Amino acid sequence: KFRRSGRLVDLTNYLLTHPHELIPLTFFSERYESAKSSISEDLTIIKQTFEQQGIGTLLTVPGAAGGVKYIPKMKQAEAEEFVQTLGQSLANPERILPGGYVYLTDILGKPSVLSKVGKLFASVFAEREIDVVMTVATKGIPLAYAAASYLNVPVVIVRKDNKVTEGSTVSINYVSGSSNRIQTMSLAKRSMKTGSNVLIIDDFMKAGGTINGMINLLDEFNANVAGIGVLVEAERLVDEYMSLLTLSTINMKEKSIEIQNGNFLRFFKD
Amino acid sequence: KFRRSGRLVDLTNYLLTHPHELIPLTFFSERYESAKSSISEDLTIIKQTFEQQGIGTLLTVPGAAGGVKYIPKMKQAEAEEFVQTLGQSLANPERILPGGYVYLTDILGKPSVLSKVGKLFASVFAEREIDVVMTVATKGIPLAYAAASYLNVPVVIVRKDNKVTEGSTVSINYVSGSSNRIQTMSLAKRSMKTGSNVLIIDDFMKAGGTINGMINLLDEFNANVAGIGVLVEAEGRLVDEYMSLLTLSTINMKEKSIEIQNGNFLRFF
Ligand SMILES: Nc1nc2c(ncn2[C@@H]2O[C@H](COP(=O)(O)OP(=O)(O)O)[C@@H](OP(=O)(O)OP(=O)(O)O)[C@H]2O)c(=O)[nH]1
Ligand SMILES: Nc1nc2c(ncn2[C@@H]2O[C@H](COP(=O)(O)OP(=O)(O)O)[C@@H](OP(=O)(O)OP(=O)(O)O)[C@H]2O)c(=O)[nH]1
Numbered sequence: 001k002f003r004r005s006g007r008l009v010d011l012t013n014y015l016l017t018h019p020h021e022l023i024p025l026t027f028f029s030e031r032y033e034s035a036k037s038s039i040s041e042d043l044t045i046i047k048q049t050f051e052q053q054g055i056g057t058l059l060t061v062p063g064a065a066g067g068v069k070y071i072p073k074m075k076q077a078e079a080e081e082f083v084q085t086l087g088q089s090l091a092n093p094e095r096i097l098p099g100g101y102v103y104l105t106d107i108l109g110k111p112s113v114l115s116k117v118g119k120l121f122a123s124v125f126a127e128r129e130i131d132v133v134m135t136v137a138t139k140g141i142p143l144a145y146a147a148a149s150y151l152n153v154p155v156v157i158v159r160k161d162n163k164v165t166e167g168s169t170v171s172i173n174y175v176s177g178s179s180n181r182i183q184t185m186s187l188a189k190r191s192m193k194t195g196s197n198v199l200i201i202d203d204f205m206k207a208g209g210t211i212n213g214m215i216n217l218l219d220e221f222n223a224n225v226a227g228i229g230v231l232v233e234a235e236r237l238v239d240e241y242m243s244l245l246t247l248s249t250i251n252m253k254e255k256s257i258e259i260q261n262g263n264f265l266r267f268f269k270d
Numbered sequence: 271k272f273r274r275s276g277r278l279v280d281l282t283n284y285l286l287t288h289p290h291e292l293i294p295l296t297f298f299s300e301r302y303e304s305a306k307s308s309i310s311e312d313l314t315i316i317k318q319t320f321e322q323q324g325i326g327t328l329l330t331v332p333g334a335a336g337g338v339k340y341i342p343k344m345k346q347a348e349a350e351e352f353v354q355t356l357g358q359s360l361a362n363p364e365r366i367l368p369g370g371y372v373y374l375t376d377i378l379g380k381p382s383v384l385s386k387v388g389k390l391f392a393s394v395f396a397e398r399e400i401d402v403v404m405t406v407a408t409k410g411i412p413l414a415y416a417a418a419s420y421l422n423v424p425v426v427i428v429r430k431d432n433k434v435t436e437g438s439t440v441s442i443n444y445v446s447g448s449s450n451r452i453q454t455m456s457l458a459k460r461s462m463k464t465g466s467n468v469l470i471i472d473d474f475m476k477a478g479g480t481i482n483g484m485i486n487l488l489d490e491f492n493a494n495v496a497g498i499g500v501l502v503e504a505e506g507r508l509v510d511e512y513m514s515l516l517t518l519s520t521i522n523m524k525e526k527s528i529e530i531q532n533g534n535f536l537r538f539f
Pocket of ligand 1: 099100101102103104175176177178179204205206207208209210211234250
């Protein structure tokens with residue numbers, strides 16, 4: 001069957017792979033052929049270790065329709081050290097592109113980096129009620145999936161083309177600050193339940209025209225924005241958002257990227 | 271310092287979050303302030319439990335240059351049952367779209383499905399030399415990042431635009447079987463090192479002209495095809511060796527009927 005040593009390894013792996021799911025104690029008890037009191041002490045050790053190591057926390061919801069829920073969390077210390085390292089790598093002037101753009105797609109591709117950004121996002125929005133994570137194609141998509149895996153919620157991708165083949169669609173128009181052109185963004189009607197609570201994730205925000213377009217698109221679904229998370233904000237039509245980094249405009253002459261913290265610390269108060 | 275119980279929990283978490291990394295036994299000795307004799311006892315328990323529970327294999331390589339490595343693996347039974355499960359739910363007649371297309375957007379969006387498809391891909395290609403996972407925007411991107419996270423390699427996204435502003439780009443042309451139009455797919459030059467071993471991941475293959483486009487694009491970088499993996503292949507093929515989970519028989523738009531069976535994935539077990 002299972003001795004205690006293996007039971008803890010399996011318990012640890014089951015929790016880590018089912019974050020934000022409520023598991024009844026009888027599930028573990030029947031699985032390891034052990035008493036619910038022995039399971040509860042194993043969950044006490046996992047709890048203390050998760051907290052000490054900065055992995056997360058275990059919530060116990062009481063009652064027969066209760067159980068345990070693993071919640072990924074990030075300590076403020078690991079958060080600002082990681083954001084500091086991130087900003088230092090984004091500071092590289094080799095990333096400067098024509099038009100004052102910054103090359104970040106190597107960073108959005110590394111697995112270690114994405115899992116920590118996704119964990120950070122999930123840590124900050126852990127206690128909101130999120131049905132779905134939403135972003136717009138294309139570069140926001142890795143971030144959206146990292147965050148959604150820790151939160152255990154589907155991802156919805158807003159498309160800027162009505163090229164697509166995925167059934168009936170709803171589109172709106174929005175003004176970016178860029179092309180002050182009116183671009184269009186769209187979403188399949190069958191890809192989001194109406195009334196859902198949406199966490200919006202995106203790679204980058206300047207004055208927020210794209211995110212505000214996502215907000216108005218949610219109105220057409222009678223959905224609610226549970227939160228807004230952005231990796232980089234430029235130095236604003238939007239409301240409350242969390243940002244990891246702040247980018248001061250690229251001085252294209254001096255070849256200089258200057259980046260500081262975002263407002264993320266505001267969300268780590270003891 | 272940790273007692274044995276907290277050490278097992280931390281050790282499990284650390285291994286699960288650092289797959290395919292050779293970790294020296296001395297890293298854990300300094301970490302936990304304990305002998306390599308005690309840590310080797312814990313690795314032995316984790317190894318047995320990872321293997322019994324279908325989580326993966328814990329490979330111990332001796333020597334100073336060696337250590338411990340966690341390799342995500344899927345057992346055949348779990349692969350058979352998950353693929354059958356996925357196959358039936360995709361054979362839902364509501365998924366049929368105008369033009370004979372099949373709506374996958376919801377499946378490719380759920381986190382628990384993606385982690386098992388990603389783990390399946392990573393289990394089959396676990397022993398191959400891979401520097402990077404590559405896919406085409408947009409729907410392949412979830413599968414590619416799922417598989418890459420288990421393999422611990424970066425992800426590279428081929429754009430069917432050339433619009434994109436990420437520096438100097440290499441573009442090629444290719445013919446779909448669809449629009450027998452010649453479309454264009456591009457790849458930034460600073461997003462791929464010369465001679466990279468590339469695992470191609472996509473959501474759907476019919477004739478293979480998109481995947482064949484990606485292979486042609488890899489030669490402009492003198493990169494190699496480490497492997498090709500697709501969620502769904504259509505019946506009836508310019509491509510070489512690939513792995514598929516599902517096969518889709520053309521939607522009889524008259525009958526309202528999607529017919530789907532297993533792919534070729536069993537031949538890798
Ligand atoms: N320097 C830099 N900019 C980025 C990066 N990623 C996105 N941007 C830009 O930020 C802006 C996104 O903000 P939006 O949500 O579109 O809101 P906005 O219309 O008010 O600008 C876009 O620039 P834009 O305002 O839409 O037009 P433009 O300034 O490029 O001419 C987008 O091109 C990056 O990595 N580095
Ligand atoms: N039924 C269905 N088909 C999909 C779906 N997603 C992509 N396809 C089709 O699969 C094909 C992509 O495979 P390719 O790699 O391009 O293979 P190919 O060039 O030899 O045709 C495209 O059609 P095509 O092979 O170029 O021609 P056609 O069969 O669409 O007429 C594409 O339209 C889907 O979700 N459902």
